[PDB]
Amino acid sequence: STQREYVFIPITNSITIDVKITIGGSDHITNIDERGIHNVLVITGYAVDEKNGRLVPTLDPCDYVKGILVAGTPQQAQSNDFLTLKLPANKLYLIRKKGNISDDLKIYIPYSSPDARNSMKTKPVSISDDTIVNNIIKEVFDKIYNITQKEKVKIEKVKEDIKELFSYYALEQ
Amino acid sequence: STQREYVFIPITNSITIDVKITIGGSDHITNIDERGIHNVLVITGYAVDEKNGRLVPTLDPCDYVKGILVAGTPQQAQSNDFLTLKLPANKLYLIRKKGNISDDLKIYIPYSSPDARNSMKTKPVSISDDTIVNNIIKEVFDKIYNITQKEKVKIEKVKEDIKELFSYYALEQ
Amino acid sequence: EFLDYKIIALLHDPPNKAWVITGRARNLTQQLSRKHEKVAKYIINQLFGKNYSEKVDNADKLASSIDRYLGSIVYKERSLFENRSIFLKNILLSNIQRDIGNLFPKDKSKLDNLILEYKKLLNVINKTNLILKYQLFYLIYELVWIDSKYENTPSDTRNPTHTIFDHLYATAAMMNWILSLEKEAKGYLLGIDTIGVADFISKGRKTRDLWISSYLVSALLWYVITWFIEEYGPDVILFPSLRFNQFYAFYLLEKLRKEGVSEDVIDEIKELITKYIFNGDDLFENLKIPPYPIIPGRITLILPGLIREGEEYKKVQDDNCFISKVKERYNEGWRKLIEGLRCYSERKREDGFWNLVCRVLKLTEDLLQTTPLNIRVKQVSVTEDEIFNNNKLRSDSWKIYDNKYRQLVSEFKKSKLVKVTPESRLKLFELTKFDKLPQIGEKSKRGYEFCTSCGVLPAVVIMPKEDELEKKLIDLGIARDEKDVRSIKNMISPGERLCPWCLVKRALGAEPRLMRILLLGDLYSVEKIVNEIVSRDVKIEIPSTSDIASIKTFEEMIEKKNEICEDLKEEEVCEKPSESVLSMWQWFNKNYYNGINLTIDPEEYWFSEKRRRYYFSVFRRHRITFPSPYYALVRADSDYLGDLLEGKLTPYLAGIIDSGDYANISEKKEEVNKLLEEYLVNAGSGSIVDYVKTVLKCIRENLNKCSCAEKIYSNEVAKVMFRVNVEKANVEEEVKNSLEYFETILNEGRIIVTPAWHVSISSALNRGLLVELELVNKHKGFVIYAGGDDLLAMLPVDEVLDFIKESRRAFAGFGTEKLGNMCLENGFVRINNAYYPSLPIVGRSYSVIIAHYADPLFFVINDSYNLLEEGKEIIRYRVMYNGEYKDAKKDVAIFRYQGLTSVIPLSLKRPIVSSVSDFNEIASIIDVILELKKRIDEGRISVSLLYDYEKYKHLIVASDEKYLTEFLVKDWIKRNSLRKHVEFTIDEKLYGVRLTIENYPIKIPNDLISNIVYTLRIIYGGEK
C-alpha cells in the first residue's frame, strides 16, 4: 500500500527521467493546499552532484537538500543506484508541518557513489532565474500535481515559496 | 592528502578485525594529549548497527555517531561493502579541536547495507559495562598508539573520556 | 519617558560567548574591530544602541551565582582561570557534562544571516508597539537559535551550570529590579496561588467538567498575567518560565495577527511555534485554543517600582497597588467570561440547551457575581538600601533575592493554615430558607435539592429522572418542543441537578471556544470573540470515562472495519463521519477517518442495559473482546519542588533531610556537608575546581575567618599573575569573599537561590511538560491537566505501567525514542543539537486509581489526590545511601483498586542519580512487573502466582542469605508456571526492601516483592 519516493527540486534540469510512477496511491505526502508547499522533506548532510544530478552523501553538518515526496518507484529499473530504507515517519525531518503522518513508509532516494577521487569541496546554491522555477513547475509540478493550473489560482504562491525556501549546497565542479 | 580510516567504538567486541595496519599515515588526527582523547570525529544522520558493527545511513538528524579518526586502509580488500570517500577537513564537526588539519582527507567509514524491510526504531545507547571499556582500551586503544601503556600509565584520562565522549545510536533491531 | 531597555539585557552577552573566549581560529575577534561584547554590539542592529553601564556592573552580577562562585575579579577578567574544552553541566547534577562541539556562528557572514532571520520576523512591526517587538523577541530569540541548528553554550566554561539563555533571561528579570532602583525607589516580588484547586477540579460528573475546571484554573491566571506581560513585557514572570509556554505563544501570535500583519511573516514564526513550543501539531489552529491547560495555579513575578498612566513609567504611588490590581483583574476576568457566555447563549436561543443557558443565566446573575474560584496574593518589597551602597552593590547584596524569596513563600505557609472554600463567598440564607431559589425543573419536595456536580451548592436546573423525559421536559421550563430534548438531553444526563457554577461549567464545556475571552485578554472586545465563535460551528468532542474504557474496543473495530460493520450499518456505528468535529484527544484525531463513528456513546451501546445483548453477540462472533468498564486515572507530581526552588537538599535526599531537618540543620550536618561539597567541587571543570576544593578544605573543620585562607590565596595569587592586562590588584579580599560565600552555603545548608536558578528550573519544567504531553498521547491517554511537575490524565488500565515507567524515566531526562522534536538523552533534552538540562535529581510520585467508568469523579479525584498527598509522606522504604541502608519517603507509585493498594518504589538510591549508571535504575521495578505481566498473558505463568506468594514470604523475609532467596523465588515461580521453563529472575536488589507506614488506614505489605503481586492484582482487576 504505502511505498513512496523522495524527489528534490534543484535549479538545473534532469529530473523527470527518474520515475514513471507519478501517482502511486491516493495522495502524496507534500500537500499544496492553495497556501504553500508544506511537509517538504529536508535531508541533512547531503548534497547534489551537478552532472546528471543525484543526491550524494557527505559529512558537512550544513549541507542539505529540500525535496518533496511522492508515491512512486524510480523508473521501475532503478534500485541499483538508489537508497531504499524504512522509517517510522517520526524520524522524517519535514518543514512547515500541517498535520500528522502515516507512521509507516517505504522510501527510495537518489543514492550516489561518493567517489573519493574527487577532492570534495561544495558551494551553496539558490533557486532563482524564474525560468528555472517555471520549468520545474511545468516539468514535475504538473505531472505529480495535475491540480495546479486547473483550479489553482495561487500558483504564484507556489512560485514564491520555491523562490524563498528551497535551497541546497552543491559540489559545483 | 594522507589517507586515514575512521573507526568507531560500539559496545560490541566487533572492532577487532577491521584495520590490519592500524597506521598508514605520518601522524594521527586523534591525540591523547595529557587531557584525554581529543579531535574526535562526529557524523550526523547515521547509526551503528552493532550486529556486524558498522554505520548505517538514515535521514534523521536525531541520529549521530562518534569515533576516533585514525590512519590506515580498509582491510586491503574492502570498498565492496565498506565506504570510500574524501573530505576537505574543513567542513568537519570535531570534538575538542586540538590536532592537525589535513585540508584534504580520504577516509573509510565502516558501512552496512540498508536491508529495507525492517523499520529502524533507533535508540540512543552510550557506553556502559565498564569491563567493555577496560578490554576496549586493551583491544583498540593499545594497537593504535604504542605511547599508550608505554610512556604513560595514567590511562584513567582516556577511561572516563570513553564513557563521556563516545555515544552512538543503537538500532537494536 | 521611555525606559525598560531590557532588550539589551537579553543581548549584553551573546550566544556566541564561549567560543570567542578561548577561540580555536580567532576570526570574529579580528573581523569586527572590551573583547567579546563587541559581537553583541554588532548584533545590536534592530533596536536601540547598547547601554554598557547598566547591566554588567549590576543585574549581571546579581542574576546568576557565577559572580559569587568564581569571584567578581575572575568573573570579569575572564582569562585568569581558563580551560580549553567547553562543557555544560546539569544545574542539579554537576556530575554529567556535555560535548558541545562547534556548530555556531564562526564566520562574519553567518552571524549576519541570523541577524537577517531575526530581522525579517522583526522588520514587519512598527514602533507604536515598542513593547510588542520585545515581547515577540523574548520568545523567538531561542527558538530561532535552535531552529537553525546551534548548540547552546553555558554562561561560562569556568562554571558550566547555567545555559546561556537562562542567564540572559535572568539578567532581564533582575533588570526589573535594577531599573526600579536606579530610578527613585522600589523592588517587588509578587506571588499568587489559587486557593484549593484540588477541591475545584474534583467537581463534575463528566470528564468534560474536569477538563474545563482545570482549564479555568489556568485561564483565569492567564487573564490576570496578560496585564503584566503586556505592561512590563513577558519577562516579568519567574514562575512558570514562559520561554516554552503554549499559552504565551498562542496569545503572542494571536496579538500579532491582531492589528494587521502580513499573513506571510506570521507563518514564518507560526512554524517555529508549532514545531517547538508545541510538538509539531497545529491543532490549536484547528481548535483555535491551546489544547492543554498548562498554567500551575501558583505564579511569581518580579515587579518593578514603576507604573503607567503618566503615558510612561512613573514611581508607584503606594504599596498596595498590585494586590488590589490582580484581585480586580481576576474578578473582571470571571465576569467577562460569564458575560460572553450570556452573549453567545442569546446568539443561539434555539438548540434547546443554549436556550436553557439563557433562561438560567438571567435568573442567577446575582449568584454568578462571585467567581467559583478565588486566589491568595502575597507580596514582598525591597529598597535600594538593601542592594546598594550609594555607589555600587553591597557585599551580601547577593543574598537579598534569596532572603526576599525565602521571605515570600513563608507568608504563603502562614495563609495556608486556613482554607476557605469559594462557596462561602455566596449568600444563601434567604435563598435556601424563604424559597427564593430559582428552580428550572421540579421544585424539590425536600427543600432545595443539592447539586450533583459540586454536591455542595443548591441546584438551579433539575433535569427529571429518566422515566418519560420528553413529556416531562415540555410541561416544565426546560424545553419547548420535541426537538430541543435531543439537544438538551445531549449535555445534561436525565437526572442531573446543576448549580449555577456547575451549569456554567457545562455550558463552557458545550463549546470550549469562549475560553479565548480570557486567553487574549483586553485584546479583542468580548463581542468580537463571540462573533467569531458564532460564525464557525465546528464541534469539540471531549471523551468520557466510557470513551476511554472503550479504547481497545474501538481499536479492534478499526482493524475489522467492514467485517464488523457488515451486520451493522443500521446502528449508527459504521456510519460515515459526516461532520468536521475534532478533539484535543490526540488518539481521537488519529482515528475518526478510520471507519468507525467514534462519536458514539459506549454508555448507549454496550455499557447499556436495554442493549448489549446485540453487542455482546457481535463482539463474540467477530473475535472481539467485550470491553472492560474500568479506566485508570494517573496523577503525578514532583517531590519537594518547593524545597527545590528554595534551594534545599531535600529534593536530593528525600527521606533523610526531611522537612524539620531545616528547623535545625546541625543534626544533619554530615549529609548536607557531604552533598553540598560534592556538588560545589563538581560544578566547574576549568582550572578552579582545585582552588574551590582547597577553599572547602579551609571551610571544612571550621578553620577560622581567613585564619586559613593563606592556604588558598596562594592558589589564586600564583594564578592571577599569569595575565598582565589585569588592571588593578584586588586578590587580597576576593579570596576572602569566596570562602565567606562557601561557608554561607555550607552553614545555611542549601544552595542560595538566584533568578538564574529559577528560570533554569521552571524552563526545564515546561520542557518536561512538553515531553510528558507527547508521552501521554502515545499511550492513548487523555490529559486533563499536566503542568510541569504535576499531571492528571485518564489512561486505559493496560498502558499504565508502561506509561509510568516511560514518564518517570523521561522526567529524569532518559528515554529511548524521540517524542516529537524533543530528542531526550541521558539527563538532557536534545532539541536538534541544543542540550537543555532536566530534573534527574528530583523525585516524582504517581497515584493510579483503577476506577469503574461509572464511579463518581468527585470521589475518584479526591481519593487520587489524597492517596498521593498523604501516602507520599507517610511511607518509608529501605534505600541505600553511601552504601548504607536508610529510609526514604518519596518516589512511590501508589496503586489503588476498590480496596487493594500497593506501593512501588522508584529510587532505591536516595541521591537518585549521581552518575550515568543510575538512569536505568529508574523505575526498574515497573519493568519487572511488566515482564511478569507479559508472562501471564502468554499463559506461561498462572495467575495463581498472585495467590501463592504468601506461603513464600514468611520464609523469604526471615532470611539473610541472598543465594537462598533466589532459589526460593525461582521455586515460587517454578510451581506456578505453565510452559516448559519460564525465566523471570527478579533482580535480587529488591530482596529485603522494607516498606513501612506511620499507622494510617492505608494497608500495605511490608515488602516490595509482595507489592509487586498486589500491583498485578490491581492491574488485572482493571480488566474485569
Ligand SMILES: Nc1ncnc2c1ncn2[C@@H]1O[C@H](COP(=O)(O)OP(=O)(O)NP(=O)(O)O)[C@@H](O)[C@H]1O
Ligand atoms: N491548571 C491546573 N489544573 C488542575 N490542577 C491544577 C492546576 N494547577 C495546579 N493544580 C493542582 O492544584 C494543587 C495546587 O497545590 P496546592 O495549592 O497545595 O493545592 P490546592 O488544591 O491549590 N490547595 P491549596 O494548597 O490550599 O491552595 C496541586 O494538586 C496541583 O497539581
Ligand SMILES: Nc1ncnc2c1ncn2[C@@H]1O[C@H](COP(=O)(O)OP(=O)(O)NP(=O)(O)O)[C@@H](O)[C@H]1O
Ligand atoms: N515555590 C514554589 N513555586 C511554585 N510552585 C510551587 C512552589 N512550591 C510548590 N509549588 C507547586 O505547588 C503545588 C503544590 O506544591 P506541593 O506539592 O504542596 O509542594 P512540594 O514542595 O511539591 N512538596 P510535596 O508535597 O512533596 O510535593 C505543585 O504545583 C508544586 O509543584
Ligand SMILES: [Mn+2]
Ligand atoms: Mn493552591
Ligand SMILES: [Mn+2]
Ligand atoms: Mn509536589
Ligand SMILES: [Mn+2]
Ligand atoms: Mn503537599
Ligand SMILES: [Zn+2]
Ligand atoms: Zn453544583
